[PDB]
Every structure is written in structure tokens, then in C-alpha cells.
Design a protein around this ligand. Structure first.
Ligand SMILES: CS(=O)(=O)Nc1cccc(-c2csc(NC(=O)CSc3nc4nccnc4c(=O)n3CCc3ccccc3)n2)c1
Length: 827
């Protein structure tokens, strides 16, 4: 009955958000995907199709020049004098791909450009105007005008002395497999804020089902906490963990319930409140009765302190300033001893010069008591703006305060769509630490989605994948409903076709696995015919890369890889005849979400390196979980497992060093071509080695390691992630490729330099990797479950030590990985 009120006011806020994104604004409503930029620290051939020219124009562009000047370098090839064409109208799309280049960005800073250079493929763009560039996704006047629908006494609280108490009445609708399995049941009640218990939990008494009511458990027990309303922060949560002692022939948790002690309008919970814990998907109703005074108790925030605290200061230098600087320059807040905490908290007004340390300060607060909020808030308002990545820590569970979080979101406005897009999973998890449906965060994400179609696309797939969390399933239903609503008729119809495609592909995969031995191909062709029927009545965009528009299935290219998963090779025809055909893997019966995380962490190491001008030539491939234990995976062309290389070589010749080199000589015959390709191997192997050690991917064998024909090395099956007890292994044929001989060369010295440089550049961002892995804890991936799992990664990243002693540390890992051939080299 406030739940309906809360939703109603959300919708009101979301209508008001929409008014800032009118259909007419091409900036915020372009109707097309933007080709992604990743800002980079020389020259290239671009081929541009031009309307009314039989041949496309090919010329050299300074990779450093802006798409804007390139657009008319290309009008200068057809037009001798360009006053009689409006350059503004013209845009540049990638051939085959309904994605448009960003005028005010470098050519070199586009993902599509960096990728072509890496693979040495033809950059193929199309010159065209806004009028002729597909806009089927654009929002309409109807969409903007349309409504938002989804899928008296006053005591203040600081004066309220009433002790927090409530009666756990009953649970209703317990299944009959429960009434057999367990005799008695019991609730563990837990009171928390900032993700931590305020008091030790209180157990209810142990009670069986009520007389003549096998669907009902009745406790009718008053529970009293040793705390009064005054002492409860606004974001205080109640957690009733229902448990069940097994009948003869340790009681198991049967479900959890969340209950905010205040509601969205700051009023304390009064009266009877119902919550729903889910077990299949069957709905049990828990009745908690809170007191009903004649009066409403409302949380009021303290009186604001306007004092501005600078100018004259103690400026003591007894090494106390040095110790403060030491903890300011500490990698992170992780491991920070209670002593380091009080020290910071006192010299906090001296730290005002180093904005990105605020998280250490807030985590070193003595408490979040009403009294002390006034001085913590004063600081926050005079505090300088934080880097968006630094602010991310302030949306973790640790900081539940609504002013901290809302201010973290204001600093984050600074971030580019292009960087947020690779950070969306973390942001979708953080939504579990907003106790209220409306919040600065969900408005920030919904407003970014309105303004940028890649972000709306990715939010879609990530919210759908969060619906499956039984505890937060309802929160995410309302966030999804608001996104789908505010996205328009255009966006939703493509997302429906996209949903429809993945479901059919999943059906096909299930049936192919069910089919046994021969006739598996015949089953694939028969099941694929329904997808053939689906494309006959629909053009559809590819979920993995919605820039690609499939129109048709190519059945004779459609295949199944030979594996326990039996993944399918889905080949599709591009709807643009300027395009190349579409190849993806659809895999069923593996939870891809962890594969997705490995990839993201690798991609962020890439970006960190590119930032500092280090290019390790990394293969960056996409993976999307479409539901639970299924999704679509990018296929890398002209690549093969290490195993398969060694096997092929084993048939002719018995030299262990020769196989990788012989495979690369076959696809790169010229000495220059072989050199270019072994150098791609040096660089990409180095990135792979660093990534393997930091992320703890210790599972690397001849099957997990892949090799593109161009020389680039990469990993595919991230089965073991953050693994505990040489973390990477360099075989003798890997060594041969880097040396380019069986004796060592300065190419091996280039390999170690690259490993160490790249390693230090990741250690300088230790705090980003920790925040990005903590924010994924609530996601329920098996080997990322506690704040201990992070410590292994921090341990691997060795942050106390200089770049000098880290370089010695990693160089010793390389000596160790070489195993027995290590003796051939000099360290
Ligand atoms: C310009 S174009 O459009 O015409 N070329 C193009 C474009 C896109 C894709 C393909 C394509 C078709 S088949 C393929 N893959 C291979 O050649 C190597 S196999 C393999 N590659 C993996 N890449 C990544 C992530 N994962 C994988 C994985 O799992 N595999 C399968 C590994 C395997 C080996 C042996 C038995 C079972 C599974 N790319 C072409």
C-alpha cells in the first residue's frame, strides 16, 4: 500500500526524466548505434563508398585526424570545391554495420579502426547523409507523449525512544514436500546498515505448522532489538532468514526477506507488512506486525553545518604528514588497520588536496550515528569532485548512506558513454544497495540509456539476467519495465525479435544435444528451419553486436562444434550487401556470466595499457548470456587451439620447438609476414601472461589457449577464475617463436620488458580492479563470493612494493614458467 505509492512516484519521476529527452533532439535520439571510441595515447588506408561512384575511393588518412576532416577529405575526392554540399548532413558508417563514426573523435580512437589495424583488415566505410542512415530505432512523438507504466501527529525519529520491536506472526503457503521434509522452522532476524550487522541476530523459537493448517507456520512471537528508533540510520534493513530443521529420515536456509525500517518518504514502518520469499518459483507470505501508534514517526536529517573548513593549518611535519601521505598513496582501503583508520579520520580536513581518497576516509568513520552525520555531510559538500572510477567504490554495499551515494552519482556524470558501456554490469549489481526504487543511480542509468542506444541495449540484457536472482527479482522487474517503457516502440520491437531469436537458438541447441550420434546434423537442419521461418517474416539485429542485421540463415555454413557443450556455429547473411556474413556460437548449458567477467577484466587491462600508450595487440571478443546457462559468443576467425597445432605438427616431424612456428609460417610465408606475426605473438603472449597471473586463471592447458593465424594469442575457456594453489607456462615452441630461434635473442628481452611494464600499469590501478570485482560479488558467480576472494587478486598485484621490485618479482615468474629450458636463458 506504500509499495504502490513508491512505484507511482517512480513513474512520476520517470515521466519528468523523459521531458529532458524530446524525440526531436538528434544528439540524444539519433536512431542509430554510435561506433565506440576508446581514447588512444602514423597512418592507414581507408576505403569509402560514395553514392554515384562505381568504385569506392581508397586513400591514406592520418589516424590522428578527426572523422569530421576525414568526411570531407572524401568530399574533396569527388568535389573540386565543396561550398555546394552541406558537410553537416554527411556521416560515416562502417560497411555492413548500422553504426556511425563519431565526428569530433580521432579515426585512430574507434574500436572498429583499432581492430582492423590489429588484424591488418581493410577499413571499409560508407559516405552517406543522416536522411539515408537507418533510424528504425529512433523514439517518436507518440513515445514521448505516451505515459510511463511498468512491466496526523508527526514525531521526529531522533526524539523517538520506543525500542525497535515487531512480532513475526506467520508464513503462509508452504508446499507439501516441506510438510514431509521438516518438523519445525525458525526465523533468524538480522538488523544491518552499510551492509554490516548493527547487532547480533535474534533467532525466533522453533515452531511447526499450525493445527489443521499444513500451509501455515504461526510463531506469534514478539522480537525486541537492543536499539531505539533514534539510533536507526535511515537505510536500516531487516533480514528474516527462514530455516527448517530436517525430520529424522543442520537446518537449511529456506529463504531470506528484506524490509526497510523506513519507506521512500522517510516514515518508519508501522502496522502489518507482508513479504514474499520465493522457493521452483512458489510464493510464501511472511507477516511481520510493527507497532501502530496514533502517530507517524518520520526520519528527519540533522541540521546542516555551513562551516567551511582551509587557509591556516597545523602543517605538522613529524612524519605524521608523511604517514598521512603514505596511507593517501596506499593502493586501496582493503587491509587498512583500525589504527590507520582513526589517524586518517582526524587529519581528514588535510586530505582535501587528494579527492580520490574520500573512500578511505568514509570507511575509517567511527560510526553513522545521527549526531555525527552533520560533520560528515559538511565535509562531503566542500569535498572536490572525484574521478568517476574512484567514485564507483561509493556505490558498493559498504556505503548505504543516501547522500554519499547520490553525490557519488553526481561525480559520475563526468564519464563518457563509451567507458560506462563496459562498466554496466557493475552498475546493475550496485542497484541491490539502493533500498528505494527511485534513486540517483537508476535515474543516471535510465538517462544514459535514453541518450545512447548501446547503453540501453546492454542494460536490457543485464537487467533480464538479474531478474533470475530470487531476492531482487521484483526490484529488477520495475527497472526493466521503466527502461523498456522509456526506450520507445522502435527500440522494444527490435528487442522482442532479439529475444525471439535467442529462444529459438536455445531450442535448437537443446535438441542437437538430445540427438545422439548420426542424424544430429539432420536434427540441426530440421530444428533450424523454424529460424529460417523466423527470418522469412523479420530482419533481426544480432544480440551480441546489434549493429549487424541478419536477414537470413545460411544453413550449409550452419554447424555444431564437437564438445560436451556441443555449441552451434550459427552463420547468417548480412542485410547490407556491403557487409561480410555473420558468425556466432550459441552455447547452452554453461553459465556464461563468469566467462563474461574474465573478458571484461581483460578488456579493462587492455584499456589501461592503451591509456599509457602500451599496445599488447590483445584479442578482445564478446560474450552475452541470453538467459540462464545459455548465450551467444563471438567467434575469432582463422584461429585454432594450441593442442590442435601440436597434433597437426606431430603427424609430420617430432621437433617440440617447431609446431607453433610452422603453423605461423604456413599462414605467413614471407619472412616479413612471419616476423610481423611472431611479433604479434610476443606482444599478445605478454598481455596473456600478465592477465593469467592477476586474475588467477591457473587452468591454462593446450585447449584453453587459442592462437589467431595473424600471430595473436588469447584464452577461451575461463573455467578456473581467481584460482588458488608457475601460474602461466611458456612451452619451448612458444619460446622458439619469441626468440625466432632455439637460442635467446633481444626479442626475449622485449617480451620480459613488455610483461613487467604492463604489470606495473595494472598495479597502478589496483583499486579499480578490486572495486570492479567486489561489485560482482552479489551476482553469485561460484568463485567470487567473499571479500577474501578479492585479497588473492590484491596479493597477486603486490601493491606495497616499488615498480623496481615488482619487475624482479614478475621476471622470476617468467623464469619459473619456462620450467627446465629456463637454464638456456640469463636472469
Ligand atoms: C570477415 S568474415 O565474417 O567472413 N570471417 C569470420 C567472422 C566471424 C567469425 C568467423 C568464424 C567462423 S568459425 C570461427 N572459429 C575458428 O576458426 C576457431 S574454433 C573457436 N574459436 C573461438 N573464438 C572465440 C571464442 N571462442 C572460440 C571457440 O570456442 N572455438 C572453438 C574451440 C574448439 C576447438 C576444437 C573443438 C571444439 C571447440 N570463426 C569468421
Amino acid at each position: 500500500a506504500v509499495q504502490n505509492d513508491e512505484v507511482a512516484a517512480f513513474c512520476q519521476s520517470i515521466m519528468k526524466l523523459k521531458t529532458k529527452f524530446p524525440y526531436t533532439d538528434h544528439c540524444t535520439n539519433p536512431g542509430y548505434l554510435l561506433s565506440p571510441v576508446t581514447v588512444q595515447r602514423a597512418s592507414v588506408k581507408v576505403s569509402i563508398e560514395i553514392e554515384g561512384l562505381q568504385l569506392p575511393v581508397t586513400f591514406t588518412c592520418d589516424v590522428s585526424s578527426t572523422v569530421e576532416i576525414i568526411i570531407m577529405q572524401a568530399l574533396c575526392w569527388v568535389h573540386d570545391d565543396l561550398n555546394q554540399v552541406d558537410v553537416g548532413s554527411y556521416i560515416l558508417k562502417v560497411c555492413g554495420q548500422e553504426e556511425v563514426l563519431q565526428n569530433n573523435h580521432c579515426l585512430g580512437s574507434h574500436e572498429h579502426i583499432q581492430n582492423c589495424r590489429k588484424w591488418d583488415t581493410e577499413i571499409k566505410l560508407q559516405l552517406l547523409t543522416l536522411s539515408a542512415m537507418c533510424q528504425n530505432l529512433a523514439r517518436t512523438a507518440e513515445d514521448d507523449e505516451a505515459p510511463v507504466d511498468l512491466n496526523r501527529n508527526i514525531k521526529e525519529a531522533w526524539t523517538a525512544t520506543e525500542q525497535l520491536q515487531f512480532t513475526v506472526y506467520a508464513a503462509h503457503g508452504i508446499s507439501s514436500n516441506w510438510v514431509s521434509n521438516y518438523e519445525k522452522y525458525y526465523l533468524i532476524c538480522s538488523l544491518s546498515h552499510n551492509g554490516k550487522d548493527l547487532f547480533k541476530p535474534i533467532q525466533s523459537k522453533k515452531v511447526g505448522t499450525y493445527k489443521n493448517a499444513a500451509y501455515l507456520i504461526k510463531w506469534d512471537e514478539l522480537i525486541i532489538f537492543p536499539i531505539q528508533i533514534s539510533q536507526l540510520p535511515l537505510e536500516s534493513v531487516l533480514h528474516l532468514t527462514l530455516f527448517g530443521v530436517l525430520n529424522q529420515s543442520g537446518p537449511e536456509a529456506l529463504g531470506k526477506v528484506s524490509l526497510t525500517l523506513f519507506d521512500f518518504k522517510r516514515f518508519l514502518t508501522c502496522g502489518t507488512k507482508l513479504a514474499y520469499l520465493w522457493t521452483v518459483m512458489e510464493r510464501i507470505v511472511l507477516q511481520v506486525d510493527f507497532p501502530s501508534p496514533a502517530f507517524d514517526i518520520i526520519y528527519t536529517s540533522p541540521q546542516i553545518d555551513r562551516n567551511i573548513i582551509q587557509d591556516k593549518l597545523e602543517t605538522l611535519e613529524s612524519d605524521i604528514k608523511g604517514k598521512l601521505l603514505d596511507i593517501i598513496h596506499r593502493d586501496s582501503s582493503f587491509g587498512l588497520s583500525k589504527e590507520d583508520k582513526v589517524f586518517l579520520w582526524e587529519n581528514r580536513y588535510y586530505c582535501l588536496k587528494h579527492p580520490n581518497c574520500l573512500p578511505k576516509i568514509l570507511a575509517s568513520a567511527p560510526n553513522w550515528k545521527w549526531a555525527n552525520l552533520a560533520k560528515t555531510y559538511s565535509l562531503l559538500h566542500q569535498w572536490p569532485p572525484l574521478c568517476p572510477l574512484a567514485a564507483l567504490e561509493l556505490l558498493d554495499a559498504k556505503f548505504a548512506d543516501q547522500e554519499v551515494r547520490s553525490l557519488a552519482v553526481s561525480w559520475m556524470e563526468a564519464i563518457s558513454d563509451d567507458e560506462l558501456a563496459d562498466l554496466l554490469p557493475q552498475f546493475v549489481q550496485a542497484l541491490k544497495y539502493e533500498i528505494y526504487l527511485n534513486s540517483s543511480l537508476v535515474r543516471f542509468l535510465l538517462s544514459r540509456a535514453l541518450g545512447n542506444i548501446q547503453i540501453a541495449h546492454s542494460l536490457y540484457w543485464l537487467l533480464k539476467d538479474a531478474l533470475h536472482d530470487t531476492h531482487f527479482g521484483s526490484r529488477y522487474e520495475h527497472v526493466l519495465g521503466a527502461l523498456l517503457s522509456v526506450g520507445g516502440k522502435g527500440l522494444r520491437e527490435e528487442l522482442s525479435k532479439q529475444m525471439k531469436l535467442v529462444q529459438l537458438l536455445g531450442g535448437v541447441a537443446e535438441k542437437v544435444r538430445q540427438a545422439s550420434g548420426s542424424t544430429r546434423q539432420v536434427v540441426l537442419q530440421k530444428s533450424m528451419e523454424r529460424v529460417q521461418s523466423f527470418f522469412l517474416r523479420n530482419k533481426c539485429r544480432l544480440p551480441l553486436k546489434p549493429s549487424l542485421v541478419a536477414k537470413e540463415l545460411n544453413i550449409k555454413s550452419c554447424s555444431f562444434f564437437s564438445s560436451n557443450a556441443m555449441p552451434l556455429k550459427v552463420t547468417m547473411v548480412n542485410a547490407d550487401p556491403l557487409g561480410e556474413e555473420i558468425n556466432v556460437m550459441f552455447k547452452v548449458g554453461e553459465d556464461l556470466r563468469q566467462d563474461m567477467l574474465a573478458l571484461q577484466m581483460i578488456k579493462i587491462m587492455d584499456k589501461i595499457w592503451l591509456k599509457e600508450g602500451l599496445d599488447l595487440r590483445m584479442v578482445i571478443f564478446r560474450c552475452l548470456s541470453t538467459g540462464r546457462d545459455r548465450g551467444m559468443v563471438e567467434l575469432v576467425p582463422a584461429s585454432d587451439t594450441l593442442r590442435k597445432i601440436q597434433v597437426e605438427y606431430g603427424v609430420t616431424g617430432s621437433f617440440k620447438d617447431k609446431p607453433l612456428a610452422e603453423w605461423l609460417r604456413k599462414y605467413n610465408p614471407s619472412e616479413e609476414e612471419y616476423e610481423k606475426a611472431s611479433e604479434n605473438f610476443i606482444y599478445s603472449c605478454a598481455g596473456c601472461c600478465v592477465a593469467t597471473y592477476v586474475l588467477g586463471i591457473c587452468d591454462r592447458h593446450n585447449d584453453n589457449i587459442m592462437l589467431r593465424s595473424t600471430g595473436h594469442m588469447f584464452h577461451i575457456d575461463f573455467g578456473k577464475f581467481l584460482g588458488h594453489a608457475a601460474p602461466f607456462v611458456l612451452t619451448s615452441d612458444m619460446a622458439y617463436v619469441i626468440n625466432g630461434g632455439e637460442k635467446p635473442t633481444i626479442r626475449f628481452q622485449l617480451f620480459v620488458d613488455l610483461c613487467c611494464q604492463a604489470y606495473n600499469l595494472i598495479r597502478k590501478q589496483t583499486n579499480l580492479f578490486l572495486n570492479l570485482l567486489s561489485l560482482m560479488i552479489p551476482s553469485g558467480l561460484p568463485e567470487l563470493t567473499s571479500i577474501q576472494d578479492l585479497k588473492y587478486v590484491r596479493d597477486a598485484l603486490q601493491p606495497q612494493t616499488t615498480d623496481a621490485e615488482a619487475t624482479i618479482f614478475f621476471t622470476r615468474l617468467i623464469e619459473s614458467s619456462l620450467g627446465s629450458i629456463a637454464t638456456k636463458f640469463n636472469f
